[PDB]
Structure 1
């Protein structure tokens, strides 16, 4: 069939939706950012959730 075979599973999805899922009133909510690089810097530095 047309569906692909190499599909991430198990741990990969576990990490992925945890990255993409949102929460209410986390640390750093309601902030404006320049781009994804600032988001990565803020996450790795611990200034934002």
Structure 2
């Protein structure tokens, strides 16, 4: 119950947030952007994943 709520809040998208539509080199700077507060937790973003 708590874990699925944490996921459903974590993986979603609102149409306007911080860092809307920026580009990311991977998951690591996704974490550095969220935990610094520059970009929001959910904003649609092109990333590079392997």
Higher strand share: 2
Give the Cα separation in 2 of the matches to 1:18 and 1:38. Answer: 20
Instruction: Give, in whole Å, the separation in 2 of the partners of 1:19 and 1:42.
Output: 14
| Distance in 2 between residues matched to 1:37 and 1:29, nearest whole Å | 18
Structure 2: 5+ residue stretches without partners: 41-50
Q: Which runs of 5+ in 1 are unaligned?
A: 1-9
TM-score (norm 1): 0.78
Aligned residues: 40
- Over 3 Å off, 4+ runs: none
Cα offsets for 1:3-40 (capped at 9, x unmatched): xxxxxxx1000000111011011111110000000000
Q: Over the residues paired in the alignment, what is the CA RMSD in angstroms?
A: 0.5
With the length of structure 2 as denominator, give the TM-score of the two structures. Answer: 0.76
